[PDB]
Design an enzyme around this catalytic site. Structure first.
Site, short mmCIF file in Angstrom:
data_model
loop_
_atom_site.label_atom_id
_atom_site.label_comp_id
_atom_site.label_asym_id
_atom_site.label_seq_id
_atom_site.Cartn_x
_atom_site.Cartn_y
_atom_site.Cartn_z
N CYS A 12 4.90 5.23 -9.74
CA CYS A 12 3.83 4.86 -10.00
C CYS A 12 3.24 5.25 -11.01
O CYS A 12 3.38 6.16 -11.96
CB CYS A 12 2.81 4.71 -8.57
SG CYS A 12 1.92 6.57 -7.93
N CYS A 17 -1.37 7.26 -5.16
CA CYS A 17 -1.55 6.62 -3.68
C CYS A 17 -0.36 5.68 -3.40
O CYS A 17 0.33 6.09 -2.75
CB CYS A 17 -2.61 6.03 -4.63
SG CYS A 17 -4.29 6.37 -5.07
N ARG A 18 -0.06 4.67 -4.67
CA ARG A 18 1.25 4.54 -4.44
C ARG A 18 3.16 4.87 -4.10
O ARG A 18 3.20 4.64 -2.68
CB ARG A 18 1.99 2.63 -5.34
CG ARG A 18 0.23 2.11 -5.11
CD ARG A 18 0.07 1.45 -6.29
NE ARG A 18 -0.12 1.82 -7.45
CZ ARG A 18 0.07 1.27 -8.99
NH1 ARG A 18 0.25 -0.39 -8.88
NH2 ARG A 18 -0.41 2.02 -9.59
#
Ligand code: MOO
EC number: 3.1.3.48
Length: 157
Positions: A12, A17-18
């Site tokens: 990412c 987050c991802r």
């Protein structure tokens, strides 16, 4: 139980987050299939802006809701990554152009680089940045991740 060793790098922009969600979903699948020992798994960022940082708190709570933990510290993708991983899976078309660009500076690039969403049985190609979203967006990323990661695994398994 003896095989060969496969590796995958989840990517990412910020690795906050991802990819940390992807990476943690991925270990769980593998652990649950009793195949950890044959897998090297990791997550990285296109950007250096957040190296050393813990994953976003909403990603941690999202995974917790699912019985999963992570201890990841954000790190940047390096040129060795292109020669050391079998697969580099990314979130969006941007991550994708960014990495193809770097890999170029790599002589014996041996990693296959693709969109993780390319594995989605539901066809949602892109994994959206949930940074400015809410807890529901974190969840939907988790959901995609599970679909995509199980689909990828059944095929490189
Ligand atoms: O770690 Mo990200 O690239 O903000 O989802």
């Amino acid at each position: 139980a003896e095989q060969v060793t496969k590796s995958v790098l989840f990517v990412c922009l910020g690795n906050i987050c991802r990819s940390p969600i992807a990476e943690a979903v991925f270990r769980k699948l593998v652990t649950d299939q009793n195949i950890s020992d044959n897998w090297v798994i990791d997550s990285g960022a296109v950007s250096d802006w957040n190296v050393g940082r813990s994953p976003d708190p909403r990603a941690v709570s999202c995974l917790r809701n699912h019985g999963i933990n992570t201890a990841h510290k954000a790190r940047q993708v390096t040129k060795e990554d292109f020669v050391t991983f079998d697969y580099i899976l990314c979130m969006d078309e941007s991550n994708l152009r960014d990495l193809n660009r770097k890999s170029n500076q790599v002589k014996n690039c041996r990693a296959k680089i693709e969109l993780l969403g390319s594995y989605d049985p539901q066809k949602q190609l892109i994994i959206e940045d949930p940074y400015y979203g809410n807890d529901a967006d974190f969840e939907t990323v988790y959901q995609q991740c599970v679909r995509c990661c199980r689909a990828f695994l059944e095929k490189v398994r």
